[PDB]
Amino acid sequence: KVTKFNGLTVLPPLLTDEMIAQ
Amino acid sequence: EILDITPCSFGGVSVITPGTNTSNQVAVLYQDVNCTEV
Ligand SMILES: *[C@@H]1O[C@H](CO)[C@@H](O)[C@H](O)[C@H]1NC(C)=O
Ligand SMILES: *[C@@H]1O[C@H](CO)[C@@H](O)[C@H](O)[C@H]1NC(C)=O
Structure with missing residues (x-):
């Protein structure tokens, strides 16, 4: 959604963004 | 013939250093440049 x-x-x-997801 | 103009590569240079009281070894980080222009 965010562009x-x-x-x-x-x-x-x-x-x-990968570590944030963890 | 049609030519693209792409500005020459450039960027900040930052130095990684542990505190001098520990050591004088230093590693340099070239920001946003491929390791070929160096
Ligand atoms: C920093 O270096 C000084 C030498 O002038 C010494 O007296 C001090 O103990 C050192 N500090 C550390 C944390 O190594
Ligand atoms: C640097 O250039 C090489 C081409 O030899 C390329 O494979 C690599 O992805 C480039 N890296 C960057 C960060 O531009």
Whole structure:
């Protein structure tokens, strides 16, 4: 249901969705 | 001929360090770059 190159970096979250599910 | 312009790779560099009082070994993390551009 839930849905550039200018120095804007999107860091990844520490807990991937997999461990959150656990 | 039609050319794509993709900006050259870049990103922040962060250093992993245990506290100096323990040791001076350091490992470097290159953010969001494939391990080829290095
Ligand atoms: C940190 O290093 C100092 C040396 O100046 C020492 O006195 C201290 O005990 C050290 N601390 C730890 C937690 O190793
Ligand atoms: C890095 O490039 C290789 C191509 O040799 C590719 O297989 C790999 O998925 C790439 N990794 C990233 C994070 O872009």
